[PDB]
Amino acid sequence: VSTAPYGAWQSPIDAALVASRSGRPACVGAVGDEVWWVAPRPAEAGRATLVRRRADGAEESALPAPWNVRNRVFEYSGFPWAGVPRPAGGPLLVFTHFGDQRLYAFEPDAPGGAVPRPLTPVSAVGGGLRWADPVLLPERGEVWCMAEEFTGEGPSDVRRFLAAVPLDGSAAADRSAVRELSDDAHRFVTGPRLSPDGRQAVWLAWDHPRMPWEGTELKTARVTEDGRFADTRTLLGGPEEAIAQAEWAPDGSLIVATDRTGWWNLHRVDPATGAATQLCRREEEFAGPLWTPGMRWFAPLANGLIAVVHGKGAAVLGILDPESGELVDAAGPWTEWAATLTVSGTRAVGVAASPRTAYEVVELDTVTGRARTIGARHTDPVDPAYYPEPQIRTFTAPDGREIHAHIYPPHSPDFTGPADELPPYVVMAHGGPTSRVPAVLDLDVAYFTSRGIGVADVNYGGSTGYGRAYRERLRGRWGVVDVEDCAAVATALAEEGTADRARLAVRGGSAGGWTAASSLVSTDVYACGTVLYPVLDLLGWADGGTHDFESRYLDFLIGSFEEFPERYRDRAPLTRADRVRVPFLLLQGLEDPVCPPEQCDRFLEAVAGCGVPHAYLSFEGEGHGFRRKETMVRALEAELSLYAQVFGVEVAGVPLLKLGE
Numbered sequence: 001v002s003t004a005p006y007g008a009w010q011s012p013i014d015a016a017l018v019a020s021r022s023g024r025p026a027c028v029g030a031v032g033d034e035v036w037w038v039a040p041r042p043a044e045a046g047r048a049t050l051v052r053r054r055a056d057g058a059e060e061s062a063l064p065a066p067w068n069v070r071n072r073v074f075e076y077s078g079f080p081w082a083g084v085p086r087p088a089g090g091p092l093l094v095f096t097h098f099g100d101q102r103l104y105a106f107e108p109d110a111p112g113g114a115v116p117r118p119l120t121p122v123s124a125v126g127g128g129l130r131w132a133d134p135v136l137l138p139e140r141g142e143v144w145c146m147a148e149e150f151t152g153e154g155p156s157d158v159r160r161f162l163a164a165v166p167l168d169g170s171a172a173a174d175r176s177a178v179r180e181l182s183d184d185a186h187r188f189v190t191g192p193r194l195s196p197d198g199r200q201a202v203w204l205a206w207d208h209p210r211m212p213w214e215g216t217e218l219k220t221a222r223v224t225e226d227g228r229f230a231d232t233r234t235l236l237g238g239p240e241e242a243i244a245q246a247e248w249a250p251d252g253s254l255i256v257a258t259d260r261t262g263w264w265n266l267h268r269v270d271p272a273t274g275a276a277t278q279l280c281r282r283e284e285e286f287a288g289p290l291w292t293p294g295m296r297w298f299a300p301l302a303n304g305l306i307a308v309v310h311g312k313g314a315a316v317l318g319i320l321d322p323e324s325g326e327l328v329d330a331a332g333p334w335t336e337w338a339a340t341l342t343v344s345g346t347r348a349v350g351v352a353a354s355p356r357t358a359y360e361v362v363e364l365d366t367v368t369g370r371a372r373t374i375g376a377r378h379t380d381p382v383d384p385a386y387y388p389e390p391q392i393r394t395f396t397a398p399d400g401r402e403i404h405a406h407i408y409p410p411h412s413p414d415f416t417g418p419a420d421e422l423p424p425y426v427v428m429a430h431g432g433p434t435s436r437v438p439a440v441l442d443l444d445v446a447y448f449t450s451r452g453i454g455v456a457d458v459n460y461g462g463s464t465g466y467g468r469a470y471r472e473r474l475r476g477r478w479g480v481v482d483v484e485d486c487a488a489v490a491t492a493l494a495e496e497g498t499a500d501r502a503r504l505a506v507r508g509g510s511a512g513g514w515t516a517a518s519s520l521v522s523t524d525v526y527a528c529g530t531v532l533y534p535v536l537d538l539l540g541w542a543d544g545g546t547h548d549f550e551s552r553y554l555d556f557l558i559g560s561f562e563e564f565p566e567r568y569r570d571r572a573p574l575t576r577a578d579r580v581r582v583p584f585l586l587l588q589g590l591e592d593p594v595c596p597p598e599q600c601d602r603f604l605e606a607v608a609g610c611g612v613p614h615a616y617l618s619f620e621g622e623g624h625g626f627r628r629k630e631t632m633v634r635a636l637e638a639e640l641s642l643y644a645q646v647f648g649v650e651v652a653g654v655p656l657l658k659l660g661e
Contacts, residue, residue, distance in 0.1 A: 001414055006423035006452035006500075007649035009415040012382040013450050014653065015640075018443040019632035024359035025051070025351045025376045027294070030344035031093070032085025035375065036062070037340075037351070037361060038069050046627030050081060050095060052108060053361070053375045062108050067116060068098035071132050073148055075547040075593050075624065078132025079191070079294025082143060092167075094119065094143050096131055103131045103143065105167060118172045119143065119165050126150030126157055129175075131165075133191025133294040140227055141167050144181065146191045146203070146293055155593075156548045159184040162192050162203060164227060181229045182221070188212070188549070189219075190293035195248045199223055200271060202235065202246050202254065204290070209552035209560070212290040213434055213464070213471065215239040218246050218256060220271070236274040242468070244287035249300035255279070257287035257297060259468045264288070266298060266308065268322070279306070279322045286310045288339050289434045289464050289471075299343045305366050307348030309337045313392070313404060313465050314438060317341070317350045319366050330364040330371035333357060336438035349374065353440035355390045381443075385413035388449035390439045395492050401473075403485045404466065406439040408455040409498065417452055424503030424647040425454040427490045427526070429515035431508065433474060433482055433557070436465040447636065451651070453643065454499055460485035460515075476564075478557035479522075479571040482515045487525045503527055503647045507639065509587075510534065510595060510624065517573040517603070520580045528646040530639045532587040533595045533624055536603045538572040547593050577606035583613040583659055585642045587635050589622030613659040615642070 023040030026048075030036075033055040038048050041061075047068035053059045063069065070077045081095040090109025097104055097116070104116035123129045127150045134145035147163040164179035171177035181192065186205035194201050201223050206216045217237035221229035237243045237258070244264055246256040254269040258276065264287035267276035280286070286308055287297045297315075298308040306320045308327070317337045318329035330337075334352035338359065341350045346366045353359040361375030388408035395403045410423045417423060426448055430437040437457050445455050459465070461481040462474025474481050486506065494501035506529040508516040513534025520529045535541055542554055542561060558567045569575055588600045597618055604616055617638055619631050626632050637654040644651035645659065 001416060003418060004415050004452070005649050006410055006417040006421060007644060007647050008651060009410075009412050009450065009452040011386065011412070011447070011450035013386060013443060013447050015447065015633040015636040016629070017381055018447050018636060019629040021358060021381060021443055022632060024338065024353070025361050026338070026340055027079050027081065028340050028342050028349055028351055028361060029081070029083065030342045030349065031083035031091050033344070034085070034091065035342070035344070035349055035361065036081070036083060037375065038080060039376070040627070041065070042627065042629035042632065046629070046631070047098070050093070051375065059375055063095075063106075063114060063116070066099070069095050070098040071096035071101055071130055072098075072127070072593075073130045073132035073146070074188075074292050074549040076292045076549070078146070078292045079134070080132060082134040082136045084136045084138055086138070092136065092138065094134055094136060101128060101130050103134070103145070103165060105169070117169055119167065119169055120178070121171060121173055121175045123150065126153050131163070132292070135192060135194065138167070140164075142227070143167060144192050146189050155544055155546065156551050158548055160187060160189050162189060162229070179227070182219070182232060186219070190290075193246060193248055194223065195271070196250055196252050201229065202248075204243060204246065209555040210239055211434065211553060211556055212244070213242045214556060215241050216243045216290070218243050218269075235271075236269065236276060244290050245295065245297055247298065247300055249304075249306075250302045251304065255298070255300060255306070259287075262469060263467050266306065266320070280320055280325055280327060282310070283467065284310050284312045285315065285465050285467070289432070291435070295339050296341045297339055299341045299348060301343045301346065301348065301366065303346060303366065307341055307343055307364070309339060309341060309350060311465070312467075315465065317348060317352065317362070317364055319348065319364065319369075328369060330362070331369075332362070332371040334362060334371070336440045353438070355439060355441055356384055356387060358441050383413065386450045387411070387441055387446050388455070392439055395489050397485065397488045401461070403461070403488055404459040404463065405489045406437070406457040406459075407493070408445055408449050408457070410452045410454050411449050412452070415452065422497065422500040423452055423454045424505065424643065425456055425490070425493055425499040426505045426507055426643065427456045427458065427486050429458060429460065429482060429486050429506070429508035429512035430463070431510035431512045433460075433462045433478065433511040433515070434464060434471060436463045444636065447640070451640075453647075456489050456493060458486045458489050475556055476559045479514070479518050483518050483522060486515060487519065487523055490525055505529055505643055505646070508532065513595070514573065520582060520584060521573045521576045522579070524581065526582060528582045528642055529584045530587070530642060531584060532635070533589055533592050534573075534599060535595055536573045536599045538568045540598065540602065542568060545596060545598075550594065574603055574606055577603055578610055580607060580610070580612055583642060583646055585614070585638055585657065586616040587638070588616070588618045589624060589626060590618050590620050591622060592624045594624040611661045613661055615657055615659050
């Protein structure tokens, strides 16, 4: 061990490694005795593939490049695939290919191998046709899902509805061959979920200016013999009751996750009257913000038990016995489970991670209570001694409010810093803002901590996982609550003597980019900041400047334009861009439909000539969030260079970022 300036420590974790290990298994699902999920392939043009895990442990990608398993529904991508086992010929699968947004069918065990065949037609009107949250119904020769069909050129010139697509491919070039199960009365809808007897279907629906975590309605309809929906009606829910998920149990009962008690809790619902009964009342979340159709936090098992990812703050998979109310959680090293789940037999399969291991596909068996890794088994790319030791902390703000955060002090088995110095700290604001960041192994974090730079990840007011009230703290306060909560954690660390007050950076992407930019504009706490694909121009964003799903998100975040037009100008970072007095780095994807690059262009124009050192790096072929390995490498090394230059520390191995006023 040797002494070296904080930020200058030699680390075995390079940006290429971080990019290579980025992402996680997602949208897990059982298919007969197999388990499938979507996995990232950053080195393969940033595509996502389908991984097939066989009963004997065989685990391989089922689709070669350039097939890309992702869609643009809600511009965040709804559950992109479905599969069913068959007596012969192997399983039948369907997936949405990102390149053309079409739904494809394929049979992995067909002689010759997987050969995707298109099932849906395309459109040149606006954003065309998109599909997601499918359910395969081989008996009807169809796949049922929800669809987006643009009717104009505007971001909100789109209709959504539940559809039935023929599996024989007869609709591949015939829009009329697609059956509309529901009408388009609701702007936003999720895929259908059919009762065991196949006579009743449910789905979630909502409209502007509400986000689903504000409120949603659970729609229902009788499924006729010939596959049509009859007597559609609202079963339960409303503009202030957030129903995040609805599922049919194998016994025919209906279960939903609703936050009527102030927390998302599971309730059994009378399929006719809509009356709900609590199954496990707790001050813990059993669901989360529904950003895309198809998310699953709970899953009913054939034996009557219910698998549930739940918790206040960190969420973990557990098994609930709805008759006794007893809940038993998985053990093992995993401390955080993602919002994806599936069941098979007596087993529940999810995706989880720990501070020492990346997300893996984990199985929990109700018979033994045993949890084990069954996919994407984590191997350490470097000695785990180079990973930071997270400190889950709750800070107390001036008025006594609690602010939840994850602190990652600098950490290395080879270095320690100068006794007369303190480490710089990077304060991170997660995206959303209606979401939460978990405390698990993240090489993006370790990238900095292993070099001697601390990290503070703040789950500021408005974050999820802590009840509707905590989530609602941000309503009408965006630009204030998120900014002040993050700064409170920052100055607290400095005051406590664990972080260098003069070397604090703020960073974040999307909503987090707004928070970072807002922090540099409205406070003078930070020495510099890194802003990724942010919201900077509110007037522009509100004036057809973003995708449909978030086109009225500002109503929640800062108030309606009708009631508070002044905030749209007053709180926009763009408005006071000239108040930024420290260096910053702006990163942007040129194909971003959530935060158009115009946001950055206008901001850069507003700061020109102010004499503030800065840099801008945009990337062709990248949308909202970077997916290509080469992009991430350049973005991460650029961020580190900014910090190296501002914090006054020599950091080679990383190209010197050209900062210009």
